[PDB]
Amino acid sequence: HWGYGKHNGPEHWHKDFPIAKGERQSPVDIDTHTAKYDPSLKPLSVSYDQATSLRILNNGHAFNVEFDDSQDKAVLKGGPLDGTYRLIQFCFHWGSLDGQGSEHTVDKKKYAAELHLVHWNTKYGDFGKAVQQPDGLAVLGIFLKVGSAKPGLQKVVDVLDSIKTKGKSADFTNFDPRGLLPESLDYWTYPGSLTTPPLLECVTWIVLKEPISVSSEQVLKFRKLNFNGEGEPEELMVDNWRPAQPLKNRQIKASFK
Ligand SMILES: [Zn+2]
């Protein structure tokens, strides 16, 4: 099935998921000289006080940390959103080298990595139904650059030996996602999609202008993960990002001048 390699990477995806060639695909390039500052835009409200992380998983494409989404413990609201979106997971994408790794790009620039805090619209009852709705998901995307270390990522880095290969998971309780946010919540926003199959166009993307810094030692530990399962030839999990897709008929709004 799908991956990032020459035989099953982003250029092949459309054969199984034809929406890959659609009108609201993600990620995109964020052109800061055409993104418009938007007045109707409230500030973003991140309410992650009650967040409960469940498990971390190497799914053979990335890793995800999964969250207890049985109640309003961790919600995103405000900004461009209507209603209340519950955090269900975060996924991470990164590169083989520091100059690539992000899915979204800003003025064609690629960051070392990109995190997604994935939330589903409470009015659809669950994630399954949510993803079938054009406004069903809100994804907060945070760029990472290699500079100093992020302490709130170290928990994650420290568990990665336990999930080196596809299929492996580990308990990951009491992880605080607030520790993955930059200082500023200035953001750009646009309608798009999942960046991995099934690539459904159900996403209000909210991409933060301010990147976080991670150490070279932190990102290096992501690059030691594996795409393959235990007892298969070792294939390092790197470059698990989809490249920027056609903007087509969409405007990217900025929450800031
Ligand atoms: Zn992701």
Side-chain angles (χ1 to χ4, degrees):
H1 235 115
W2 67 272
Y4 295 93
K6 165 180 305 134
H7 302 284
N8 59 1
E11 313 309 313
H12 290 279
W13 297 352
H14 82 87
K15 302 180 258 156
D16 269 28
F17 313 91
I19 196 150
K21 283 186 183 294
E23 308 293 303
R24 313 203 297 266
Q25 286 290 293
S26 289
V28 301
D29 178 55
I30 294 147
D31 187 351
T32 64
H33 322 85
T34 68
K36 197 184 182 199
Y37 157 83
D38 181 326
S40 81
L41 275 186
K42 287 145 204 134
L44 193 65
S45 179
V46 177
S47 300
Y48 292 171
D49 14 304
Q50 300 260 97
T52 333
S53 65
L54 306 180
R55 271 207 351 206
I56 190 176
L57 169 78
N58 175 342
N59 63 17
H61 307 109
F63 65 89
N64 325 299
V65 173
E66 302 134 1
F67 286 85
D68 185 346
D69 70 338
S70 81
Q71 331 163 247
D72 39 355
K73 311 228 167 190
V75 318
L76 187 68
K77 71 216 212 321
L81 308 165
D82 304 314
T84 295
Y85 292 69
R86 206 165 308 174
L87 177 57
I88 181 168
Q89 55 105 291
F90 70 66
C91 51
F92 255 111
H93 311 264
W94 59 90
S96 50
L97 296 149
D98 298 345
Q100 63 187 65
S102 67
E103 309 212 277
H104 293 83
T105 56
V106 169
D107 299 333
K108 303 286 173 104
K109 172 218 178 38
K110 292 160 155 137
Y111 279 87
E114 186 164 326
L115 146 88
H116 300 142
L117 289 156
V118 183
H119 314 73
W120 53 276
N121 198 332
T122 56
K123 86 192 205 181
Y124 292 121
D126 72 41
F127 186 76
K129 187 92 56 211
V131 297
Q132 302 185 63
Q133 318 297 155
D135 65 5
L137 292 196
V139 181
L140 183 72
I142 309 182
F143 297 119
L144 287 69
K145 55 188 278 172
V146 174
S148 303
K150 197 71 161 145
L153 179 77
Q154 191 61 32
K155 304 243 161 172
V156 180
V157 158
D158 276 340
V159 103
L160 296 176
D161 281 351
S162 77
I163 59 136
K164 179 179 205 184
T165 54
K166 170 173 59 55
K168 295 222 168 291
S169 54
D171 187 293
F172 206 66
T173 37
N174 309 109
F175 182 74
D176 182 13
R178 285 175 291 195
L180 301 162
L181 308 182
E183 285 173 18
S184 186
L185 296 184
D186 291 347
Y187 63 85
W188 291 282
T189 178
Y190 80 97
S193 77
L194 303 177
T195 67
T196 57
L199 301 159
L200 294 170
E201 309 180 327
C202 54
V203 183
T204 294
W205 274 100
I206 295 164
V207 173
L208 296 183
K209 176 196 207 190
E210 186 171 8
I212 59 169
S213 296
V214 301
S215 55
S216 190
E217 291 84 321
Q218 292 184 309
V219 74
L220 269 181
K221 299 202 193 146
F222 287 12
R223 300 191 189 127
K224 294 200 166 184
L225 287 170
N226 283 192
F227 286 127
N228 55 281
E230 208 190 340
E232 298 180 13
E234 168 177 38
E235 185 68 352
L236 292 181
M237 187 182 277
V238 294
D239 295 319
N240 58 347
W241 44 278
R242 187 184 189 197
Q245 299 301 302
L247 190 63
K248 295 180 150 195
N249 194 215
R250 298 183 288 180
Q251 50 224 158
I252 302 176
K253 301 286 207 172
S255 73
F256 64 96
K257 28 246 169 85

